[PDB]
Design a protein around this ligand. Structure first.
Ligand SMILES: CC(C)CCC[C@@H](C)[C@H]1CC[C@H]2[C@@H]3CC=C4C[C@@H](OC(=O)CCC(=O)O)CC[C@]4(C)[C@H]3CC[C@]12C
Ligand SMILES: CCCCCCCCCCCCCCCC
Ligand SMILES: CCCCCCCCCCCCCCCC
Ligand SMILES: CCCCCCCCCCCCCCCC
Length: 177
């Protein structure tokens, strides 16, 4: 099936078709922009991503309850820092400049999810709905930010996923089966 697969030169055509294909310095805006574009800031964010994943891993069953309290405090600290990072981005860049990156939207959504999770877990039992705990996905989903830094693996995933997006009817045939 691999050897004989119909196509329904090309490199040059794709290259020739793809051939078609920052913020200013005024005030404290520029100071915040300089801080958030400083490579130390981005590296610090990466490091705290790593530490947050470590804290997410540190959970285990039947903890002394001085361990769970420490984990909750660390989660509060991490989500507070991430909200602060989102605030400094939304100030240093424009609001339109921020919500038009397709990654800053994701970071903002995960920050709001984490904050809502923190707020709910304190009085969660009073909701009495099966969807009380689904807000805990955002802490885990914060892990994705390293997939950006993993260059070849991000390229590989994006290529294969956009390939899957161009075949919506084979999946419909399997669903029909
Ligand atoms: C690439 C690595 C360096 C990054 C991740 C490091 C840690 C976040 C991971 C490494 C292995 C994990 C540990 C694997 C097994 C232990 C012991 C385990 O202790 C028990 O189960 C005792 C309970 C009982 O015996 O009844 C609790 C989780 C814990 C601390 C885990 C805590 C988090 C750890 C240290
Ligand atoms: C870096 C992460 C270091 C490991 C943290 C957990 C170490 C073992 C904790 C034992 C739980 C208390 C019993
Ligand atoms: C370009 C037209 C695309 C619309 C038709 C295909 C998309 C839907 C496919 C659904 C596959 C999974 C079934 C539902 C679960
Ligand atoms: C354009 C229209 C695309 C519609 C694809 C789905 C049509 C209904 C399918 C029903 C049976 C699915 C198993």
């Amino acid at each position: 099936i691999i050897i004989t697969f119909q196509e329904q030169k090309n490199e040059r055509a794709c290259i020739d078709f793809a051939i078609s294909a920052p913020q200013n310095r005024q005030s404290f805006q520029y100071k915040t922009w300089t801080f958030v574009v400083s490579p130390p800031f981005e590296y610090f964010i990466m490091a705290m991503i790593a530490l947050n994943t470590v804290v997410l891993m540190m959970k285990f069953y039947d903890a002394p309850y001085e361990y769970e309290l420490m984990l909750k405090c660390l989660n509060i600290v991490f989500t507070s820092m991430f909200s602060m990072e989102c605030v400094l981005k939304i100030i240093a860049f424009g609001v339109l400049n921020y919500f038009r990156d397709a990654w800053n939207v994701f970071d903002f959504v995960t920050v709001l999810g984490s904050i809502t999770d923190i707020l709910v877990t304190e009085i969660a039992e009073t909701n009495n709905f099966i969807n009380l705990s689904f807000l805990r996905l955002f802490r885990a989903a914060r892990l994705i930010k390293l997939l950006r830094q993993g260059y070849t693996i991000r390229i590989l995933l994006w290529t294969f996923v956009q390939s899957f997006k161009a075949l919506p009817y084979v999946c419909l045939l399997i669903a029909m089966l």
